[PDB]
Paper text:
More recently, the HCP was shown to act as high-affinity nitric oxide (NO)-reductase, detoxifying NO into nitrous oxide N2O at physiological concentrations, and its overexpression protects cells against nitrosative stress. MtHCP is a monomeric 548-amino acid peptide organised in three domains (first domain residues 1–222, second domain 223–368, and third domain 369–548) harbouring a cubane [4Fe-4S] cluster and the hybrid cluster.
The native HCP from the thermophilic methanogen M. thermolithotrophicus (MtHCP) was purified anaerobically by multiple chromatography steps and immediately crystallised without freezing. The crystal structure was solved by single-wavelength anomalous dispersion at the Fe K-edge (SAD) and refined to a 1.45-Å resolution. The structure harbours a hybrid cluster in a [4Fe-3S] composition, matching the bacterial homologues in their reduced state. The active sites of MtHCP and the 1.25-Å resolution structure of the reduced DdHCP are superimposable. The main difference is a 1.0-Å shift of the “Y-atom” at the hybrid cluster vicinity, which has also been attributed to an oxygen atom in MtHCP based on the electron density. Five channels devoid of any water molecules were detected, spanning an overall distance of approximately 63-Å (tunnel length from the extremities of tunnels 1 and 5) within the enzyme from an edge to another. The channelling system connects the active site to several openings on the protein surface, and most of the side chains structuring the channels are hydrophobic (57/62), probably for repelling charged or polar molecules that would disturb the reaction.
Author numbering: 1 to 548
């Protein structure tokens, strides 16, 4: 028997920073949480069986990343959809096991690789079992390392999903995903071995973000400096949220000539920086702020909303009838975008509904400038280097990552406002919405907020830093005039963090709280070896990061 109805602590908003045990703060109900645990368990067992075979295939690789992504915060609240994904994984595992060359020989397999269920009732019973819970790992430090690795792997999986959607892949990354999953089932490993896998997860996070950067830029062009409207026009619109640029491509193609405009929301803002989307005159602008304001902003938008990935919050009744899910997203009673076997999506029902809607309510007017991904910044490298050498830019501050609901995140807005006028903020991810409309101006034409894009575009921030390290002939990335004051919420941010640690970045400030899934001993290593610190007060952190 489980000791509580559920247990989940994977996001920054976990109850009391110790764990959601009755209902998720995010709205994930206990039955859904337990089914997500079973989906992860099923994926681990599939990984075991494929690793025993010695090879995988494309359908298994895609299933694994999609199943992991299904369990990221604010992606899927639909117990029925999670049950079908569990059944799909069991079928793939049973198919794989039927191909074994040594039926019986391999040492006793873990229960995740052999459990079965022939009805939804039996699936639900297994989901409610102790063995699938996070707390099944009894030692606190092993549990912390296993969960930290798992959440990093979920972040990798999400980015790899998007690359695969675009026709890109890297089987070495999938191999690592399977290795890491299997490691969490292996009681022979020491904490040092798990620590090494966490660092390796950072290595593969860099490789995955490199692959997604390649996929997005080869498909849609390199981001370029762009002014994005944050006001509204006078036509019915469709609002697209999340991160999938291929969904946007198809939505724009299908809305051309219809009288329905398209707007972006939250992590779709960076689509406006890509040449392939800038070409459409009905692509109006970015509506609203980050994900956590969506109940009010989706209502005010009046038109339909298409959610391509996280973050989805349980919808208000006012717009439930006009919000659609695609990809791995799910919520009971929300309509899906129809999709064929080749990944082509049909937005016809959305467009017909949009034509009947009022235009969006104006929330604000003005522009956001962005598009400073790696190609664009490297094209300005002489100007950037000259400003560093003259002291016109004294420090860069990476404030990338995720936004969220906690009012403690007012810290990030006030930190940005208190930064001296010779500093530049480098950003990516929806954390940007705490400071991207502040009107901070420019330094010799270089804006004081440089938005490289989506959270995956932290890759560009790394590429930029490594280019500056080479230009200045420095042996250590940390010798650059760069500070890190990163905000996190969901598991892609864990992958980004691990990527930065693998790249050698020290003294990161991580906030607005530190994860619940770090045990005291694991947190101590992060502090002592990597210099990780939580936020304090704006004034104290400006002093320690900028003025000392
Ligand atoms: S995803 Fe976050 S808020 Fe939701 S149940 Fe897990 S820890 Fe709680
Ligand atoms: Fe891609 S950054 Fe992480 S929190 Fe939900 S959309 Fe935001
Ligand atoms: Mg061993
Ligand atoms: Mg190539
Ligand atoms: Mg309404
Ligand atoms: Mg329906």
């Amino acid at each position: 028997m489980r000791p509580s109805k559920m247990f989940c602590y994977q996001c920054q908003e976990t109850a009391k920073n110790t764990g959601c045990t009755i209902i998720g703060v995010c709205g994930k109900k206990d039955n859904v949480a337990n089914l997500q645990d079973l989906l992860v368990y099923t994926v681990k067992g599939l990984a075991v069986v494929r690793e025993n075979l010695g090879y995988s295939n494309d359908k298994t690789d895609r299933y694994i990343v999609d199943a992991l992504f299904t369990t990221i915060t604010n992606v899927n609240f639909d117990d029925k959809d999670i049950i079908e994904k569990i059944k799909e994984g069991l079928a793939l595992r049973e198919e794989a096991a039927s191909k074994s060359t040594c039926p019986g020989c391999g040492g006793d397999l873990p229960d995740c690789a052999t459990w079965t269920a022939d009805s939804d009732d039996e699936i639900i019973k297994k989901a409610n079992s102790l063995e699938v819970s996070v707390l099944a790992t009894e030692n606190e430090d092993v549990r912390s390392l296993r969960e930290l690795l798992t959440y990093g792997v979920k972040g990798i999986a999400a980015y790899l999903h998007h690359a695969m959607v675009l026709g890109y892949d890297n089987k070495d990354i999938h191999k690592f995903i399977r290795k890491a999953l299997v490691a969490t089932t292996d009681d022979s490993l020491s904490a040092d071995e798990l620590t090494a896998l966490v660092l390796e997860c950072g290595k593969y996070a860099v490789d995955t973000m490199a692959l997604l950067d390649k996929a997005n830029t080869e498909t849609y062009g390199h981001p370029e400096i762009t002014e994005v409207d944050i006001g509204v026009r006078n036509n019915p619109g469709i609002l697209i949220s999340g991160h999938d640029l291929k969904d946007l491509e198809q939505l724009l193609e299908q809305t051309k000539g219809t009288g329905v405009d398209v707007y972006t929301h939250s992590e779709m803002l960076p689509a406006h920086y890509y040449p392939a989307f800038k070409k459409y005159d009905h692509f109006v602008g970015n509506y609203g702020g980050s994900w956590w304001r969506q109940k009010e902003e989706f209502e005010a938008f009046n038109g339909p909303i298409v959610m391509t990935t996280n973050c989805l919050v349980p919808p208000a009744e006012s717009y439930k009838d006009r919000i659609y899910t695609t990809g791995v997203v799910g919520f009971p009673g929300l309509k899906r975008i129809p999709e064929d076997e080749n990944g082509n999506k049909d937005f016809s029902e959305v467009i017909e509904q949009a034509k009947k809607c009022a235009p969006p309510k104006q929330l604000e007017t003005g522009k956001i400038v962005g598009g400073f991904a790696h190609n664009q910044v490297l094209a300005l490298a002489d100007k950037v280097v000259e400003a560093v050498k003259s002291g016109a830019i004294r420090k860069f501050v990476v404030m990338a990552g995720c936004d969220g609901r906690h009012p403690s995140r007012e810290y990030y807005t006030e930190f940005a406002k208190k930064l001296p006028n010779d500093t530049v903020i480098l950003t990516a991810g929806c954390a940007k919405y705490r400071y991207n409309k502040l009107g901070l101006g420019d330094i010799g034409g270089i804006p004081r907020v440089l938005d490289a894009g989506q959270c995956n575009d932290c890759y560009s921030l790394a590429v930029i830093a490594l280019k500056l390290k080479e230009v200045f002939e420095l042996d250590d990335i940390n010798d650059l005039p760069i500070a890190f004051n990163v905000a996190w919420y969901e598991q892609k941010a864990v992958a980004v963090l691990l990527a930065l640690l693998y790249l050698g970045v020290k003294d990161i400030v991580l906030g607005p709280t530190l994860p619940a899934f770090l045990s005291p001993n694991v947190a101590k290593v992060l502090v002592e070896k990597f210099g990780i610190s939580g936020i304090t007060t704006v004034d104290e952190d400006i002093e320690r990061l900028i003025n000392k």
